[PDB]
Symmetry: C3
Amino acid sequence: RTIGIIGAPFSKGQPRGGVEEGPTVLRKAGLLEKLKEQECDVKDYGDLPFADIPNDSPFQIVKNPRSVGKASEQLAGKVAEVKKNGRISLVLGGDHSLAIGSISGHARVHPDLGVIWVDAHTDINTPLTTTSGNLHGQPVSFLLKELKGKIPDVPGFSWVTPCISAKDIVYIGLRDVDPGEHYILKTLGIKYFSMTEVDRLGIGKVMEETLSYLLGRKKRPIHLSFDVDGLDPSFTPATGTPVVGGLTYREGLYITEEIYKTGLLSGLDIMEVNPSLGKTPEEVTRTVNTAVAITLACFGLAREGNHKPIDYLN
Amino acid sequence: RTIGIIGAPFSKGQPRGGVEEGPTVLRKAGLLEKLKEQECDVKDYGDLPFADIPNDSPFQIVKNPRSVGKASEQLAGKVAEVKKNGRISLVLGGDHSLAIGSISGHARVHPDLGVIWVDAHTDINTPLTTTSGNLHGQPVSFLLKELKGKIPDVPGFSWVTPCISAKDIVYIGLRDVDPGEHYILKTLGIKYFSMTEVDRLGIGKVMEETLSYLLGRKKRPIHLSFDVDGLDPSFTPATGTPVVGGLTYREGLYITEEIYKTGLLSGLDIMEVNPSLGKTPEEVTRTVNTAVAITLACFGLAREGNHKPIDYLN
Amino acid sequence: RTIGIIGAPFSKGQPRGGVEEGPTVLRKAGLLEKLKEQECDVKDYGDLPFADIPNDSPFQIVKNPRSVGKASEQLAGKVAEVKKNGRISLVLGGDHSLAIGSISGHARVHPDLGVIWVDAHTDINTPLTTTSGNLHGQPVSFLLKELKGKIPDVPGFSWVTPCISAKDIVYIGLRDVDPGEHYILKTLGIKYFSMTEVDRLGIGKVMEETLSYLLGRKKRPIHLSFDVDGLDPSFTPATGTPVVGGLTYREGLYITEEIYKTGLLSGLDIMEVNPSLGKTPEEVTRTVNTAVAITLACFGLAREGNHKPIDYLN
Ligand SMILES: N[C@@](CCCC[B-](O)(O)O)(C(=O)O)C(F)F
Ligand SMILES: N[C@@](CCCC[B-](O)(O)O)(C(=O)O)C(F)F
Ligand SMILES: N[C@@](CCCC[B-](O)(O)O)(C(=O)O)C(F)F
Ligand SMILES: [Mn+2]
Ligand SMILES: [Mn+2]
Ligand SMILES: [Mn+2]
Ligand SMILES: [Mn+2]
Ligand SMILES: [Mn+2]
Ligand SMILES: [Mn+2]
């Protein structure tokens, strides 16, 4: 398989700036070379240059709407180009608002994609249900057709056309869902496995049911949007909205190892890594190292091991 | 549902005094208000005033028997009143000897209750099998009918009538059981899931089997006596008798989330929280925060999220 | 059952010397007495005296080959004697290269043994596939009949006769396997449960399948070679080659508790404990304490508890 890296050093979907350092620290960790060690022809499309939008006052309670909207608009273009190039897109975040542009761009070339969303949160607040006003907790509401008519015309987002159905997304890892978001989940009949389901079934059954749900009818490309706070803070502490009782390192690698095995991975997001929020140098390396490992598993690095198609014993 | 809080700042069931601070720190953590945020009409019956009994020399090897006996005697009265008031009793410990009074009082109003006991220990030593002499490791022996005739007349406990059958209790979390206690388990045929069973089956199957065991024949009220050392010390370090390899935070919330879903929770104990034993301020907050979370789950706080019966989208 | 302890303070199978302190720290922890507390008649055959071999230059890339070879040669003799004495052999490592001698010696008396290998690594590099040259990452290649013809004549190892079949070994815990090793796994059809399989199935199913695989056809002695780095570094940090995402303390006790229950445990290795590598005094005690607990479980210490065949209630 071939890979296209896109850096997205953007943070205006939330208050803390350091998340725009995600792509820098992920590359410093040797991600490109490590990808190249696997079954990968890898091209770096570099970091997106997100021009400042100094005039961007809140839309109602919604913060930095033009900056967020433009960044996702730009991102969508790059993703779509990467996809036209026949490559799997790898977006390095950056805050999670960017999924608006990443999924959009992906869906331009592969309208039939299904989404697996790994996260402690549902990120499905509308501009009218959000309490925080932070757009990184709203991206999914912008993408789902079933919610069009519930998203106001927000400055910066006129270009958005919700092209994804509520029935084509699965959540894994949920453990902090706003009441408005829970209402939306139940109302639209969205498939999810909160931490309660993971505890009940085991990550094994979870992935079986997730892949069966998305791929049962027919094969179709997979978009994995991975928020690092989906994993427990003991593995990814350097992130903006940590929530205890998260997925383990092991469960994280399991999810992605199983997704690799489908051979349908088409787009990937690695989001919300914020080195500024590491309490110590070790917390930063711990968070980045975990992020890197999740990424490699998506592209074939397996715990049981890997080998080239040759005779190693001769 | 309606709730009745009872503080039980008592420690004479064991050597370390700080456990009598349990109710203070649990309330300081905002427990009442957080309960009120859920489907709860909550009333605080305050903290029990446990008068000193200066003259309380050991009965054989058994320590502080009159103090322990009186405290449980008082507790039983309060629990029974809370129960007559139609409310779920919430006892904030306090050492685990208090379960003698809590379960007793509960059973006065609901003779048909079943008990789920979450703990690293079985707390089923008799006054004659105990090695420590600490009564917090003996409460279950005082309650089981099948053991009457094996409990001597201990000062302070004349009021006790064992009204619970060995067949109506399930242990979850066991990993440090005295040889005498193990004999009693096997001999009375008590249902248990030690950590070995949890590892084997998964907490999912565990709760399925636990609830089937207690509720199969017919619905009946549930009493949950939760010792915080049931959870691994990495989540509840500030407790008197920590034992490694415990239940996870996740497993803890799972147990209680499933118990909530039955709609049969009738009495709850949150025991052995001792802030004095926290190695650092963070260990204390970690322990208290975990205790609070377990409590909220018992009353409906779910990881997948919660919402009121209204249209959130309008 | 009866037990024979053998100390193997040897480290030349790898670069770090402190692993030769394994037997000292394991005994200081009270292992002998604790074994004696269980169903054990225990004899200490002491620590093997491994004479220096000052002249031991690398064979090709393979390091300290004569020292490693002699130590395993000596170890095999002691194990075989312990086995002739009708006792379960308990080898305290020491680096993992010693499994060459331990398994060999065991197999002299019990040719029909099956091996369970708990480890983050497969330790199945040949002298010609190894990258490190460290012999502790090669012991299994010396033992398997199917690989004879692929192991060159290495100084110090002329005494080795591979008497174990690839079909009679199961790995549990794998998460860092060299490409050459992965080739060997797939090629010889070796049964393994890497961490991916553990995540998928649960340690319960894992042990069921492991024991069924080795014991289905007929009963036969079990040799457990336990590398402490099989467990996550959060439980055994003081070890030479830690790898994240390991087996839990709980999973560790589960494996060994199930192995005890078969009544077929015949040989045991407790390897790669290196107190020098503990970052703090607590890391050393944590590592040693975990090592001790795994050991006791192998000999009957159960989490649900233990009791003698007597009436404890009278
Ligand atoms: N619901 C949140 C989510 C915040 C986290 C967004 B992330 O992308 O998942 O990291 C919100 O602001 O709307 C909040 F309240 F928790
Ligand atoms: N068995 C104990 C139990 C002590 C712990 C009691 B707790 O309420 O579960 O916390 C005893 O003293 O009898 C002891 F030896 F471990
Ligand atoms: N494959 C290793 C294994 C090293 C570890 C050996 B141990 O006994 O399992 O601890 C090697 O050197 O060959 C290495 F590269 F990781
Ligand atoms: Mn999140
Ligand atoms: Mn998110
Ligand atoms: Mn306890
Ligand atoms: Mn207890
Ligand atoms: Mn190893
Ligand atoms: Mn090894």
